[PDB]
Amino acid sequence: PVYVDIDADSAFLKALQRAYPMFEVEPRQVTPNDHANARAFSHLAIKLIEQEIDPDSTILDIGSAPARRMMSDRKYHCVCPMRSAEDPERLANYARKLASAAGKVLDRNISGKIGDLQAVMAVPDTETPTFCLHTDVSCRQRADVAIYQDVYAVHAPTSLYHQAIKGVRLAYWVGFDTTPFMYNAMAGAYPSYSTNWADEQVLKAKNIGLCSTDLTEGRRGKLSIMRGKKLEPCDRVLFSVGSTLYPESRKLLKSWHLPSVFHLKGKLSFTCRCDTVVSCEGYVVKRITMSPGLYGKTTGYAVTHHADGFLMCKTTDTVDGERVSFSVCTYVPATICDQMTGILATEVTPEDAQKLLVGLNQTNTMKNYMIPVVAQAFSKWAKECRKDMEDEKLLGVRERTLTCCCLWAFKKQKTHTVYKRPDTQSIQKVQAEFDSFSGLSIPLRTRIKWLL
Amino acid sequence: PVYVDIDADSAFLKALQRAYPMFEVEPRQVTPNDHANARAFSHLAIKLIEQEIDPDSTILDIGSAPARRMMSDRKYHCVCPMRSAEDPERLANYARKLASAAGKVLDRNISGKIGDLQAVMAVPDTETPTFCLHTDVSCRQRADVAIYQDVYAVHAPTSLYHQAIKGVRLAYWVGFDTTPFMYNAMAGAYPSYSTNWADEQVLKAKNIGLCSTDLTEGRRGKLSIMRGKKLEPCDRVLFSVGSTLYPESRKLLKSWHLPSVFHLKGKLSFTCRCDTVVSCEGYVVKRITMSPGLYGKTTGYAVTHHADGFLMCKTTDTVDGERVSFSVCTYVPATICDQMTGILATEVTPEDAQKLLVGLNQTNTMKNYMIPVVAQAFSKWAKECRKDMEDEKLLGVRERTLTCCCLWAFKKQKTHTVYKRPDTQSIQKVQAEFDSFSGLSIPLRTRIKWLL
Amino acid sequence: PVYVDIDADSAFLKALQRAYPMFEVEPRQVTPNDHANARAFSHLAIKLIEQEIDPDSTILDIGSAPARRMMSDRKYHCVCPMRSAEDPERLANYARKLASAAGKVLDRNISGKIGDLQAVMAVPDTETPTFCLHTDVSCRQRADVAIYQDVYAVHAPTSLYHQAIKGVRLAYWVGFDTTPFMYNAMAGAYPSYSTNWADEQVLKAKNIGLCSTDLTEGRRGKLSIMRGKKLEPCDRVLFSVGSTLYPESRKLLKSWHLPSVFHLKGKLSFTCRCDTVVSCEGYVVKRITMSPGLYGKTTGYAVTHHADGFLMCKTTDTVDGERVSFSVCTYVPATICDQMTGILATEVTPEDAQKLLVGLNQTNTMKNYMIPVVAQAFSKWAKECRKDMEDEKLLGVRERTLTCCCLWAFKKQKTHTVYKRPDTQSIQKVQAEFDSFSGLSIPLRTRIKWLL
Ligand SMILES: [Zn+2]
Ligand SMILES: [Zn+2]
Ligand SMILES: [Zn+2]
């Protein structure tokens, strides 16, 4: 019986039960946390992974808090580099957690973890079977399993190659779905997990999930040193999971959208496979398997199955007062998508679509702040579909006109909505075939020994 | 009592019960798998085949994972070539599965399978009664039964001849129905199994099941180096079963659409017969029987019986922005097809047909992402049927006009829908009478012995 | 079982239960206090913090009344400076409370607190483990935990650095949400807590929560020595919690809106993190963690998650008779915000929106004095949204015009409402990376010893 820190009258509790049928998920709410659904999912995902791999196997745990791996009956060589600000408090809490159980419980190798902690304190560069101060790259502890839990600022092929050359044949990546970033949206929601993200460029928008703006009156033209001339997605993105914030790279998010098959080609070549094994409303687990040698061939295609609807639409907002249009993505519940099928046979207005969506939502099925952007999206889609039906072509025929040369061109129709309905698949041409592949200080090193 | 890993409140569970009446199918859901229906069907199909062939018989298992044939009381010479990326992990899991049962169970010849595996490890080119690294062609183990389970990238007559000259008299082929590829559709759905497939050319469509596109605004003519002038189905196709992807050849898919009778003519001639014995909403089992000698005569006709409706219609979508039309196939539930009979007596609009289909779907009978393409298909069909009734001809009379020569020509009417209703049969002129008919590396060969 | 001094038939009692699920909150009303909800929250917050940190730890308590920390089983070095007017009576009540328990209870170190009180009386400049007359800066008692409970007239980074250089690694700040002051509103409400605040400049308004005006008849122009020409938020603000008043600095309120990560850079550098762990309708607890050294990097972004709606709108009121417009903020219950989703698809009038809000309020969900300003706000927002939809732009395009130079300018649209819906996030660019960092008299010193 897995216990999840969520309210008993929570609708997510049912979806979570559907995502983990091998467990008896029971609500036991201890904290009023604002991203409780996300922690619930990641907790049940670690449970699944443990139940799935064989014991007596050692598990690297990248970017991890050792404290959350302290009462576990499994060899966790927690690779914990002191890079960000989240890490010294993680290490201090791991120390204060071993000390609170040094002479209480003896089914975990508590004293062995204390000894390895003090060994890595006496030597900052050493490697002990349960703890490491190196990065996932510079670590030297061989293992069979690697686990990436909510770690996105990582280049996937470099990190996976560096685990592969250390004997890791199985990696698990738990995190938010990378599909909204393969579509190059400017902003987006993972509404079930209270998560909103935006490009750094649209943080002064008015009506996306993650923004903040001012009252202005519509004054004279604010001067700029730069001409914009083009509002396009840039690398820097901000995620807010509840009220927790993190910056992230689009390049590193996209690196984790891996094809079904890829090849890691260095001094040691590996043939790797990525599958999505858990998928709940935007949050996924990817099981990656690495094998030595070059086997098979790569198409270079990554596929996303859609259990609920995925929308990416064009919205018009004001960023710092200036009215612009950019793309926005969200997840729509499958039952809402099913109940809109009949409405979407006609051209519907965003206002009628909004009142219909509000009727279908009754307790709410989807979050209401995303209903307008969804309504308008459905309205554009139903419109574009009608324009396809009216401008019907001949079967097997393209009306391409010439470029005064050996070149030909065609009209592109305007697409304001990508609507991926429940039970469809997204397929993207991503890269397979990859070839190219000391941060502590004293006052904390002193502090750790003060607890042991 | 066969146990299937599907939710107990699944409608597929009833159709599956209808497809396997000799079993007592019970839902026991362990995984939230996104193609659970497909694995359920293929599992019950292997059960059927085992209950159907006599024991003490040896069974070749083409393209197979030996791990899924390890707890079975039947002689499976699992021919397992290390061709694709799926194979090294299949072999590693077979090794890690024998080791987890080496001294547990003794009703299976566990230790004999261990000895045969490590004999094929000591010799990569040898043949042992339970394991093989050769292809289905280059294998040398004589058998009575062959089994192709989800094995499509094979030329059927070459493979069947190579099993026949080794004494195989009975082959079973489990897989998706090959009828949509005899019709040359560009894209298609097997909706009950969450499966969508597309030609490589239309992967940037917008509103098929397996596609992905961008937001654009309808900009200037994108330049091409090639003139298209013709959008026609090419050999390369992509299947997505849930989120699992595979490339497939149209030629090799079509090779498995076999006629009722065909002749394999080499040094040893065989008279072969193909029948469909299980058929559930797009997924089939073909029982093939091979007999030495030339017997009877071949018509060259393959027949598909339709328990539910089969649609192939012309849709207009945009591929990479360019509006085109191509053919799309799907399966419609028989009860939906039956309830549309009265509507389809009139000319109906796609919009009215869509609202009627949504009414008939209530819990849904068919998946909703296919309702628009089905609605439009039905409306074309009802329209074309009316145009047949108005342009009635004389009985036994063709109005063919002359070509200034000894040739004559006639008008072809436009056909935008092929609708094969429940209890009708498709018949295609296919080929009978066929005449023309070392992949391991060290680091994995080492790894296998590390588990024995 | 935590007991709260609020009426048993109070709706707040349920929200409070949701904010502290680890407790069994029971109403036990002793006082008819006009800010009972606020004291209930701050009481449950102190309980949470005690249950959360380890005992045997010493705990600074900034700006605190020692009397409210007298029956607690935890080392509270209550730093109590005699700065404001409430502090002599706080000290006298702490003395009169120790005297009423000197020979009653012995689980608290009562006589030790009496001895330390008399030690700080014998020496005004000394430091004893339970009492201090210094400011939070000039105190010299090292600790592990600091607690700021309803302490706003403090510069946050200076105070946190001064606790950090004394060994404090964990700080808790309990107080009203600082988000309305990051938005620079002129006046505002925290309605659940009966709290209204205003800029000193609009205290003579007519229809904000915290104002007072006269009857006039609309006489001749009142003369001013100053031209106003601009009504903008100034530093001085007045809060009224029930009937309790305090002046506040906008700068010091804004200093406590801390980013997720910041750096305190002095002689001793620290890497600090701020998270909101409790959040009920405008009242928050921020857990701050300080670590020695410079770790990671700072974005400079502070995020506010919105469980209920946050409005900032422009109102037109009369201040001292003169009709002006300024910004006003408030919190709208999430259920009211959800039930307005369908209404806000159209352009609605403030009058129709007001009658709809009065309908939705039935016992009231929100306080009624804020319904008109909310109604106005909603109607402006729904209007502005329509103007976004009609003036739709091209995707990724800004129409900026030139300034006869290398500069370009754009139109700003008028924004009269910032509406942050339930489950959205505010994100503000605040400062990380901080580098720049005897009040008693005799007649009371005499009085304190008279009680011991
Ligand atoms: Zn390590
Ligand atoms: Zn073989
Ligand atoms: Zn002090």
PDB file of all heavy atoms in Angstrom, chain C residues 235-259, unseen atoms left out:
ATOM      1  N   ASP C 235       6.199  55.473   0.017  1.00  0.00           N
ATOM      2  CA  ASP C 235       6.695  54.422   0.896  1.00  0.00           C
ATOM      3  C   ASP C 235       5.747  54.130   2.047  1.00  0.00           C
ATOM      4  O   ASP C 235       5.554  52.968   2.408  1.00  0.00           O
ATOM      5  CB  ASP C 235       8.073  54.778   1.434  1.00  0.00           C
ATOM      6  CG  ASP C 235       8.854  53.551   1.835  1.00  0.00           C
ATOM      7  OD1 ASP C 235       9.083  52.693   0.964  1.00  0.00           O
ATOM      8  OD2 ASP C 235       9.221  53.431   3.016  1.00  0.00           O
ATOM      9  N   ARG C 236       5.147  55.151   2.631  1.00  0.00           N
ATOM     10  CA  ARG C 236       4.388  54.973   3.857  1.00  0.00           C
ATOM     11  C   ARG C 236       3.030  54.334   3.582  1.00  0.00           C
ATOM     12  O   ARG C 236       2.251  54.832   2.769  1.00  0.00           O
ATOM     13  CB  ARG C 236       4.224  56.318   4.552  1.00  0.00           C
ATOM     14  CG  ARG C 236       3.222  56.323   5.670  1.00  0.00           C
ATOM     15  CD  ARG C 236       3.728  55.633   6.919  1.00  0.00           C
ATOM     16  NE  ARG C 236       2.842  55.935   8.036  1.00  0.00           N
ATOM     17  CZ  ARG C 236       2.805  57.107   8.662  1.00  0.00           C
ATOM     18  NH1 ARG C 236       3.612  58.091   8.293  1.00  0.00           N
ATOM     19  NH2 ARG C 236       1.956  57.296   9.654  1.00  0.00           N
ATOM     20  N   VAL C 237       2.750  53.234   4.271  1.00  0.00           N
ATOM     21  CA  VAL C 237       1.518  52.471   4.119  1.00  0.00           C
ATOM     22  C   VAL C 237       0.955  52.216   5.508  1.00  0.00           C
ATOM     23  O   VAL C 237       1.697  52.178   6.487  1.00  0.00           O
ATOM     24  CB  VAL C 237       1.771  51.153   3.339  1.00  0.00           C
ATOM     25  CG1 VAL C 237       0.601  50.226   3.404  1.00  0.00           C
ATOM     26  CG2 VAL C 237       2.017  51.461   1.898  1.00  0.00           C
ATOM     27  N   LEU C 238      -0.356  52.095   5.612  1.00  0.00           N
ATOM     28  CA  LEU C 238      -1.001  51.786   6.876  1.00  0.00           C
ATOM     29  C   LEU C 238      -1.791  50.504   6.736  1.00  0.00           C
ATOM     30  O   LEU C 238      -2.576  50.357   5.801  1.00  0.00           O
ATOM     31  CB  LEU C 238      -1.893  52.942   7.317  1.00  0.00           C
ATOM     32  CG  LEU C 238      -1.072  54.179   7.678  1.00  0.00           C
ATOM     33  CD1 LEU C 238      -1.971  55.305   7.876  1.00  0.00           C
ATOM     34  CD2 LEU C 238      -0.274  53.953   8.951  1.00  0.00           C
ATOM     35  N   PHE C 239      -1.545  49.570   7.641  1.00  0.00           N
ATOM     36  CA  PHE C 239      -2.291  48.330   7.744  1.00  0.00           C
ATOM     37  C   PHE C 239      -3.265  48.415   8.903  1.00  0.00           C
ATOM     38  O   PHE C 239      -2.940  48.955   9.959  1.00  0.00           O
ATOM     39  CB  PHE C 239      -1.364  47.142   7.979  1.00  0.00           C
ATOM     40  CG  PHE C 239      -0.815  46.541   6.744  1.00  0.00           C
ATOM     41  CD1 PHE C 239       0.198  47.158   6.055  1.00  0.00           C
ATOM     42  CD2 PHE C 239      -1.298  45.342   6.280  1.00  0.00           C
ATOM     43  CE1 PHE C 239       0.708  46.595   4.926  1.00  0.00           C
ATOM     44  CE2 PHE C 239      -0.793  44.779   5.155  1.00  0.00           C
ATOM     45  CZ  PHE C 239       0.209  45.405   4.476  1.00  0.00           C
ATOM     46  N   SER C 240      -4.437  47.833   8.713  1.00  0.00           N
ATOM     47  CA  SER C 240      -5.427  47.673   9.764  1.00  0.00           C
ATOM     48  C   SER C 240      -5.860  46.218   9.755  1.00  0.00           C
ATOM     49  O   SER C 240      -6.547  45.776   8.833  1.00  0.00           O
ATOM     50  CB  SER C 240      -6.622  48.602   9.566  1.00  0.00           C
ATOM     51  OG  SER C 240      -7.468  48.547  10.685  1.00  0.00           O
ATOM     52  N   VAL C 241      -5.446  45.494  10.778  1.00  0.00           N
ATOM     53  CA  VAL C 241      -5.805  44.102  10.995  1.00  0.00           C
ATOM     54  C   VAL C 241      -6.894  44.121  12.060  1.00  0.00           C
ATOM     55  O   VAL C 241      -6.625  44.360  13.234  1.00  0.00           O
ATOM     56  CB  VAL C 241      -4.582  43.276  11.406  1.00  0.00           C
ATOM     57  CG1 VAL C 241      -4.871  41.803  11.345  1.00  0.00           C
ATOM     58  CG2 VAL C 241      -3.420  43.614  10.512  1.00  0.00           C
ATOM     59  N   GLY C 242      -8.131  43.899  11.650  1.00  0.00           N
ATOM     60  CA  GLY C 242      -9.243  44.227  12.521  1.00  0.00           C
ATOM     61  C   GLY C 242      -9.231  45.713  12.824  1.00  0.00           C
ATOM     62  O   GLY C 242      -9.343  46.549  11.930  1.00  0.00           O
ATOM     63  N   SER C 243      -9.075  46.071  14.093  1.00  0.00           N
ATOM     64  CA  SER C 243      -8.898  47.460  14.477  1.00  0.00           C
ATOM     65  C   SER C 243      -7.469  47.791  14.872  1.00  0.00           C
ATOM     66  O   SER C 243      -7.204  48.923  15.280  1.00  0.00           O
ATOM     67  CB  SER C 243      -9.852  47.834  15.611  1.00  0.00           C
ATOM     68  OG  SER C 243      -9.808  46.904  16.669  1.00  0.00           O
ATOM     69  N   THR C 244      -6.542  46.854  14.751  1.00  0.00           N
ATOM     70  CA  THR C 244      -5.151  47.118  15.086  1.00  0.00           C
ATOM     71  C   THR C 244      -4.436  47.761  13.903  1.00  0.00           C
ATOM     72  O   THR C 244      -4.506  47.266  12.782  1.00  0.00           O
ATOM     73  CB  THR C 244      -4.447  45.823  15.482  1.00  0.00           C
ATOM     74  OG1 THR C 244      -5.143  45.226  16.574  1.00  0.00           O
ATOM     75  CG2 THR C 244      -3.042  46.113  15.914  1.00  0.00           C
ATOM     76  N   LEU C 245      -3.720  48.841  14.160  1.00  0.00           N
ATOM     77  CA  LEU C 245      -3.085  49.630  13.123  1.00  0.00           C
ATOM     78  C   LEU C 245      -1.572  49.511  13.194  1.00  0.00           C
ATOM     79  O   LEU C 245      -1.008  49.403  14.283  1.00  0.00           O
ATOM     80  CB  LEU C 245      -3.477  51.087  13.272  1.00  0.00           C
ATOM     81  CG  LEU C 245      -2.923  52.144  12.328  1.00  0.00           C
ATOM     82  CD1 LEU C 245      -3.374  51.955  10.898  1.00  0.00           C
ATOM     83  CD2 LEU C 245      -3.353  53.465  12.842  1.00  0.00           C
ATOM     84  N   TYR C 246      -0.916  49.499  12.031  1.00  0.00           N
ATOM     85  CA  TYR C 246       0.500  49.732  12.023  1.00  0.00           C
ATOM     86  C   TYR C 246       0.976  50.395  10.742  1.00  0.00           C
ATOM     87  O   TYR C 246       0.411  50.179   9.668  1.00  0.00           O
ATOM     88  CB  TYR C 246       1.315  48.461  12.280  1.00  0.00           C
ATOM     89  CG  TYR C 246       1.037  47.269  11.413  1.00  0.00           C
ATOM     90  CD1 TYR C 246       1.902  46.928  10.382  1.00  0.00           C
ATOM     91  CD2 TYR C 246      -0.047  46.448  11.654  1.00  0.00           C
ATOM     92  CE1 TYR C 246       1.681  45.831   9.593  1.00  0.00           C
ATOM     93  CE2 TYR C 246      -0.277  45.344  10.862  1.00  0.00           C
ATOM     94  CZ  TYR C 246       0.602  45.039   9.832  1.00  0.00           C
ATOM     95  OH  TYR C 246       0.392  43.950   9.035  1.00  0.00           O
ATOM     96  N   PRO C 247       1.967  51.262  10.856  1.00  0.00           N
ATOM     97  CA  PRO C 247       2.604  51.807   9.666  1.00  0.00           C
ATOM     98  C   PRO C 247       3.643  50.839   9.136  1.00  0.00           C
ATOM     99  O   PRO C 247       4.263  50.077   9.876  1.00  0.00           O
ATOM    100  CB  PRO C 247       3.237  53.102  10.178  1.00  0.00           C
ATOM    101  CG  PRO C 247       3.501  52.835  11.574  1.00  0.00           C
ATOM    102  CD  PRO C 247       2.422  51.947  12.072  1.00  0.00           C
ATOM    103  N   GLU C 248       3.815  50.870   7.825  1.00  0.00           N
ATOM    104  CA  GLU C 248       4.735  49.979   7.148  1.00  0.00           C
ATOM    105  C   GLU C 248       5.471  50.761   6.082  1.00  0.00           C
ATOM    106  O   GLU C 248       4.961  51.741   5.538  1.00  0.00           O
ATOM    107  CB  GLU C 248       4.016  48.789   6.513  1.00  0.00           C
ATOM    108  CG  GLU C 248       3.853  47.597   7.423  1.00  0.00           C
ATOM    109  CD  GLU C 248       5.116  47.278   8.199  1.00  0.00           C
ATOM    110  OE1 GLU C 248       6.202  47.195   7.573  1.00  0.00           O
ATOM    111  OE2 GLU C 248       5.024  47.104   9.435  1.00  0.00           O
ATOM    112  N   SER C 249       6.686  50.324   5.809  1.00  0.00           N
ATOM    113  CA  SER C 249       7.442  50.811   4.678  1.00  0.00           C
ATOM    114  C   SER C 249       7.231  49.869   3.507  1.00  0.00           C
ATOM    115  O   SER C 249       7.298  48.652   3.661  1.00  0.00           O
ATOM    116  CB  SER C 249       8.921  50.909   5.034  1.00  0.00           C
ATOM    117  OG  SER C 249       9.643  51.586   4.029  1.00  0.00           O
ATOM    118  N   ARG C 250       6.968  50.439   2.337  1.00  0.00           N
ATOM    119  CA  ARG C 250       6.881  49.635   1.126  1.00  0.00           C
ATOM    120  C   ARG C 250       8.209  48.969   0.812  1.00  0.00           C
ATOM    121  O   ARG C 250       8.237  47.836   0.330  1.00  0.00           O
ATOM    122  CB  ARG C 250       6.439  50.503  -0.046  1.00  0.00           C
ATOM    123  CG  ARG C 250       4.973  50.546  -0.242  1.00  0.00           C
ATOM    124  CD  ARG C 250       4.632  51.312  -1.464  1.00  0.00           C
ATOM    125  NE  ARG C 250       3.307  50.971  -1.956  1.00  0.00           N
ATOM    126  CZ  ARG C 250       2.238  51.708  -1.742  1.00  0.00           C
ATOM    127  NH1 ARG C 250       2.350  52.820  -1.050  1.00  0.00           N
ATOM    128  NH2 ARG C 250       1.069  51.346  -2.219  1.00  0.00           N
ATOM    129  N   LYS C 251       9.317  49.663   1.072  1.00  0.00           N
ATOM    130  CA  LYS C 251      10.639  49.110   0.820  1.00  0.00           C
ATOM    131  C   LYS C 251      10.911  47.891   1.681  1.00  0.00           C
ATOM    132  O   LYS C 251      11.453  46.895   1.197  1.00  0.00           O
ATOM    133  CB  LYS C 251      11.698  50.171   1.084  1.00  0.00           C
ATOM    134  CG  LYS C 251      11.827  51.193   0.001  1.00  0.00           C
ATOM    135  CD  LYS C 251      12.621  52.386   0.485  1.00  0.00           C
ATOM    136  N   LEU C 252      10.491  47.927   2.937  1.00  0.00           N
ATOM    137  CA  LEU C 252      10.752  46.824   3.841  1.00  0.00           C
ATOM    138  C   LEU C 252       9.785  45.674   3.624  1.00  0.00           C
ATOM    139  O   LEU C 252      10.154  44.517   3.819  1.00  0.00           O
ATOM    140  CB  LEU C 252      10.695  47.318   5.282  1.00  0.00           C
ATOM    141  CG  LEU C 252      11.697  48.424   5.608  1.00  0.00           C
ATOM    142  CD1 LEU C 252      11.716  48.727   7.076  1.00  0.00           C
ATOM    143  CD2 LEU C 252      13.076  48.065   5.135  1.00  0.00           C
ATOM    144  N   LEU C 253       8.550  45.966   3.227  1.00  0.00           N
ATOM    145  CA  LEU C 253       7.649  44.909   2.790  1.00  0.00           C
ATOM    146  C   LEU C 253       8.198  44.210   1.558  1.00  0.00           C
ATOM    147  O   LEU C 253       8.196  42.980   1.471  1.00  0.00           O
ATOM    148  CB  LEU C 253       6.269  45.485   2.495  1.00  0.00           C
ATOM    149  CG  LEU C 253       5.393  45.925   3.655  1.00  0.00           C
ATOM    150  CD1 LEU C 253       4.314  46.857   3.155  1.00  0.00           C
ATOM    151  CD2 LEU C 253       4.797  44.722   4.327  1.00  0.00           C
ATOM    152  N   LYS C 254       8.665  44.986   0.586  1.00  0.00           N
ATOM    153  CA  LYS C 254       9.199  44.413  -0.634  1.00  0.00           C
ATOM    154  C   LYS C 254      10.490  43.651  -0.404  1.00  0.00           C
ATOM    155  O   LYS C 254      10.782  42.723  -1.159  1.00  0.00           O
ATOM    156  CB  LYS C 254       9.405  45.507  -1.673  1.00  0.00           C
ATOM    157  CG  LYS C 254       8.184  45.746  -2.523  1.00  0.00           C
ATOM    158  CD  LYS C 254       8.417  46.795  -3.567  1.00  0.00           C
ATOM    159  CE  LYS C 254       8.497  48.150  -2.937  1.00  0.00           C
ATOM    160  NZ  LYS C 254       8.233  49.247  -3.900  1.00  0.00           N
ATOM    161  N   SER C 255      11.258  44.000   0.626  1.00  0.00           N
ATOM    162  CA  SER C 255      12.489  43.269   0.888  1.00  0.00           C
ATOM    163  C   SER C 255      12.227  41.811   1.240  1.00  0.00           C
ATOM    164  O   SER C 255      13.097  40.969   1.026  1.00  0.00           O
ATOM    165  CB  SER C 255      13.288  43.957   1.994  1.00  0.00           C
ATOM    166  OG  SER C 255      12.642  43.851   3.242  1.00  0.00           O
ATOM    167  N   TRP C 256      11.051  41.490   1.757  1.00  0.00           N
ATOM    168  CA  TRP C 256      10.731  40.132   2.167  1.00  0.00           C
ATOM    169  C   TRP C 256      10.176  39.278   1.041  1.00  0.00           C
ATOM    170  O   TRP C 256       9.984  38.077   1.235  1.00  0.00           O
ATOM    171  CB  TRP C 256       9.752  40.155   3.344  1.00  0.00           C
ATOM    172  CG  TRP C 256      10.458  40.417   4.629  1.00  0.00           C
ATOM    173  CD1 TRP C 256      10.523  41.592   5.298  1.00  0.00           C
ATOM    174  CD2 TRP C 256      11.253  39.490   5.367  1.00  0.00           C
ATOM    175  NE1 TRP C 256      11.289  41.457   6.415  1.00  0.00           N
ATOM    176  CE2 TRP C 256      11.752  40.171   6.484  1.00  0.00           C
ATOM    177  CE3 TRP C 256      11.588  38.144   5.194  1.00  0.00           C
ATOM    178  CZ2 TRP C 256      12.571  39.556   7.432  1.00  0.00           C
ATOM    179  CZ3 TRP C 256      12.394  37.536   6.138  1.00  0.00           C
ATOM    180  CH2 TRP C 256      12.877  38.241   7.237  1.00  0.00           C
ATOM    181  N   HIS C 257       9.921  39.863  -0.121  1.00  0.00           N
ATOM    182  CA  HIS C 257       9.627  39.120  -1.337  1.00  0.00           C
ATOM    183  C   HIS C 257      10.956  38.637  -1.902  1.00  0.00           C
ATOM    184  O   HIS C 257      11.583  39.293  -2.729  1.00  0.00           O
ATOM    185  CB  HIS C 257       8.883  40.002  -2.322  1.00  0.00           C
ATOM    186  CG  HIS C 257       7.967  39.259  -3.239  1.00  0.00           C
ATOM    187  ND1 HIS C 257       6.706  38.863  -2.865  1.00  0.00           N
ATOM    188  CD2 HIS C 257       8.116  38.873  -4.524  1.00  0.00           C
ATOM    189  CE1 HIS C 257       6.121  38.256  -3.877  1.00  0.00           C
ATOM    190  NE2 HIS C 257       6.959  38.240  -4.893  1.00  0.00           N
ATOM    191  N   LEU C 258      11.366  37.557  -1.466  1.00  0.00           N
ATOM    192  CA  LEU C 258      12.683  37.044  -1.769  1.00  0.00           C
ATOM    193  C   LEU C 258      12.624  36.041  -2.909  1.00  0.00           C
ATOM    194  O   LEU C 258      11.635  35.321  -3.060  1.00  0.00           O
ATOM    195  CB  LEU C 258      13.294  36.382  -0.533  1.00  0.00           C
ATOM    196  CG  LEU C 258      13.713  37.363   0.555  1.00  0.00           C
ATOM    197  CD1 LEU C 258      13.617  36.721   1.906  1.00  0.00           C
ATOM    198  CD2 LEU C 258      15.097  37.865   0.298  1.00  0.00           C
ATOM    199  N   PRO C 259      13.661  35.986  -3.736  1.00  0.00           N
ATOM    200  CA  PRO C 259      13.681  35.017  -4.831  1.00  0.00           C
ATOM    201  C   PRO C 259      13.934  33.616  -4.299  1.00  0.00           C
ATOM    202  O   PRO C 259      14.324  33.419  -3.152  1.00  0.00           O
ATOM    203  CB  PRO C 259      14.827  35.512  -5.708  1.00  0.00           C
ATOM    204  CG  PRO C 259      15.719  36.199  -4.788  1.00  0.00           C
ATOM    205  CD  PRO C 259      14.883  36.803  -3.708  1.00  0.00           C
TER     206      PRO C 259
END
